[PDB]
Amino acid sequence: GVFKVMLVGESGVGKSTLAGTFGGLDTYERRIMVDKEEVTLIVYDIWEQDHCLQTGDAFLIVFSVTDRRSFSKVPETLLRLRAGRPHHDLPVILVGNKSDLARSREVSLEEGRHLAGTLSCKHIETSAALHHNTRELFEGAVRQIRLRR
Ligand SMILES: Nc1nc2c(ncn2[C@@H]2O[C@H](COP(=O)(O)OP(=O)(O)NP(=O)(O)O)[C@@H](O)[C@H]2O)c(=O)[nH]1
Ligand SMILES: [Mg+2]
Numbered sequence: 001g002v003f004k005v006m007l008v009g010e011s012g013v014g015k016s017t018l019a020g021t022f023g024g025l026d027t028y029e030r031r032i033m034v035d036k037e038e039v040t041l042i043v044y045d046i047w048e049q050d051h052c053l054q055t056g057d058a059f060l061i062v063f064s065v066t067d068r069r070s071f072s073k074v075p076e077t078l079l080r081l082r083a084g085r086p087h088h089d090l091p092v093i094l095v096g097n098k099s100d101l102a103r104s105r106e107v108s109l110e111e112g113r114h115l116a117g118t119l120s121c122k123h124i125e126t127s128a129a130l131h132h133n134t135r136e137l138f139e140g141a142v143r144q145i146r147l148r149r
Helices: 015-023 051-055 068-072 074-084 109-118 134-147
Strands: 002-008 027-034 037-044 058-064 092-097 122-125
Touching: 002 015, 002 051, 002 134, 015 027, 015 037, 015 058, 015 092, 015 134, 027 134, 037 134, 051 074, 058 068, 058 074, 058 134, 068 074, 068 109, 074 092, 092 109, 092 134, 109 122, 122 134
Parallel strands: 002 037, 002 058, 058 092, 092 122
Antiparallel strands: 027 037
């Protein structure tokens, strides 16, 4: 029961901060409880601007809601990941991070959801800074990976 979740996306969106919420005080491992069953979750924060793609069980494509450029890069990023394992139904979620910065937002909630719906991904918004929805993010990953097994 081992789950490998890869954080990927443009520089500055919050990948390391997201990993930090899971790992506390570039790979983090913990046994967590999801749906009454314990599992080993390893969160990878080794994406650079590969080993990542083959290794992963799930891919969290992180963009920042305050960085429209990072959002525009999502389609081409997802395409490359999927193309590297064309036979696999990869669990993927688009993670709109920095939701706490309301007065700096460059990407809307509904836009994120439309993108995820169009590309057949999951979608969630997080604040890695305040641990808003970060637990839900990683637990959700475990659930989708389970469906692939
Ligand atoms: N307000 C706010 N700031 C955030 C949030 N997540 C990350 N940040 C801030 O955004 C900056 C970049 O975070 P970081 O996790 O380093 O991003 P990264 O994607 O790992 N960068 P890189 O790809 O270059 O390693 C940091 O200054 C961090 O404190 C968030 O949810 N809210
Ligand atoms: Mg980083």
